[PDB]
């Protein structure tokens, strides 16, 4: 139906947003201001998004779902129009900030329409197509923006944002919220400062301080939806597996940038053609299948640390076995969360499931990188790599053990 046809247009408003991150050198000359200041400028999108998606979901919960999805898609016009209009330093900041709060509005609200769309059985067709929207949307955000920068430029990648954000609409109470964003703002850049940096132990405080001040100040959930969310976090911990693998292959074994692309796009095509098999797979069975078969995905790439001549076989099967496992768990976990969550409080509950997904990644990457960067500094590339891949196996096993607290 044209229920998802518009929704995916709002998820592709978050492909164009996270494509410009991989084309920072082009707009450093245009906007003029040096790298390091213009980089953090583009960073603000997923920054503002991660801290407001909870609130913007809880305000969409009351103010209206399609009301907020109308706000977001309208705010996605100015978000892109502001940047593409004129390139200059101070303006570039604000343009990404609103691009960030634009996503915070869309994600939880469009996740609530899906429950109204079906309310059982024909909901899995929608949530699967939603997963295609995000995983395809993020999966090629880089490979797109780069291909666009080559021929057309950095300008014609953000004019596609306004027109798709309109075509989407064509198919259409501060209870510590301020001490929530301050905990997230900090926690979001505790992983980034964790690598860079002191504010290393200093910024961990304002997270823990604004956590307990927010703990005793909408917190009300007790169902398997909790299990589906906690499992989602632990599974996204093995996101680092891919980045540490791409590094190892391209630096250690010394392949070209295109080979890295073929191994990666193989994983991308696989995972997008399993979320389809995910809905057919269904709750606990496929999520146990996914959380398990991903751990194999690692093991095949872990064993490439002790390689041979025909271990490109053992590495490839890894990318496939890793890719499909995410796809299998992909469309059942989003359902088990979206279903069990109360119809009254969907906007609040969905934002929490999406952030728990977000932090999981950033958290996993930080560990995977730090371990790799440490282990490769201590011992070698091949050795140090496996140490990082192993740390992912543990999280992937914990994600398989995280299903223990998720009954049928």
């Amino acid at each position, epitope marked *: 139906k044209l229920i998802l046809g518009i929704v995916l247009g709002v998820i592709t408003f978050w492909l164009f947003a996270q494509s410009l991150v*991989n084309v*920072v050198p082009n707009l450093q000359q245009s906007f003029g201001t040096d*790298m390091g200041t213009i980089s953090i400028a583009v960073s603000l999108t997923a920054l503002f998004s991660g801290m407001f998606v909870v609130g913007a979901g809880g305000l969409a919960d009351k103010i209206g779902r399609v009301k907020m999805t109308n706000i977001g898609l309208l705010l996605s016009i100015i978000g892109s129009a502001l940047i593409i209009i004129t390139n200059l330093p101070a303006l570039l900041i604000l343009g990404r900030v609103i691009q960030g709060v634009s996503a915070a509005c869309i994600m939880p609200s469009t996740l609530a329409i899906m429950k109204t769309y079906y309310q059982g059985a024909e909901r899995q067709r929608a949530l699967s197509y939603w997963s295609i929207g995000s995983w395809g949307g993020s999966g090629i955000c880089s490979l797109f923006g780069g291909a666009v920068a*080559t021929t057309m430029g950095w300008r014609w990648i953000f004019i596609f944002s306004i027109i798709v954000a309109v075509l989407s609409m064509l198919l259409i109470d501060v209870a510590g919220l301020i001490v929530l964003v301050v905990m997230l703002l900090s926690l979001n850049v505790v992983i980034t400062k964790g690598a860079a940096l002191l504010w290393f132990f200093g910024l961990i405080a304002i997270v823990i301080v604004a956590f307990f001040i927010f703990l005793n100040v909408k917190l009300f959930e007790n169902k398997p939806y909790t299990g589906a969310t906690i499992s989602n976090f632990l599974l996204n911990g093995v996101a680092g597996t891919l980045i540490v693998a791409n*590094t190892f292959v391209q*630096q*250690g074994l*010394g392949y070209t940038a295109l080979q890295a692309g073929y191994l990666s796009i193989t994983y991308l095509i696989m995972v997008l053609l399993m979320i389809r098999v995910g809905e057919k797979l269904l709750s606990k069975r496929p999520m146990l299948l996914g959380t398990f078969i991903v751990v194999i995905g690692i093991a095949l790439i872990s064993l490439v640390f002790l390689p041979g001549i025909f271990y490109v076989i053992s590495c490839v099967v890894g990318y496939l076995c890793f890719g499909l496992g995410l796809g299998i768990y992909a469309t059942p976990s989003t359902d088990t969360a979206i279903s069990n969550a109360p119809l009254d409080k969907v906007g609040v509950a969905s934002g929490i499931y999406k952030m728990a997904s977000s932090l999981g990644g950033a958290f996993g990457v930080a560990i995977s990188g730090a371990v*790799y*960067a440490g282990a490769v500094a201590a011992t070698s590339i091949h050795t140090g790599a496996m140490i990082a891949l192993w740390v992912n196996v543990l999280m992937g096993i914990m994600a398989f053990i995280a299903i223990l607290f998720a009954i049928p």
Partner: nanobody
Amino acid sequence: QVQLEESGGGSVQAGGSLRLSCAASGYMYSTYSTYCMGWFRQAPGKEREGVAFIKRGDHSTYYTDSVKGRFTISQDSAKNTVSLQMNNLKPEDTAIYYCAADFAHSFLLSVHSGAGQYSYWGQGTQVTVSS
């Protein structure tokens, strides 16, 4: 937290040859990304000038006019490091050579040269030539 440990260089007679190596510690690649890497020279007289740069992903090299043909930047992929093999060195080449690398980007995007783009810099290695 990405150190650039650089080695080689030093003094030699004019019309001679010199090696300059530089590796990047704990610099990881994103899902469809790479980074560009090379040297800038700066004699006590003139200001910071670009020499030779290479895109780590697909050996996409770029040189300045001055050094074109004599200098040959390249990456020892198995040992993981870039190195600028300099030849027929003229006394203009006498300066402090700084190994640098820019923030990562889509591998589809082209190699970089402008000092504004490069963000990671090495302590600097000295090279001098004479009669």
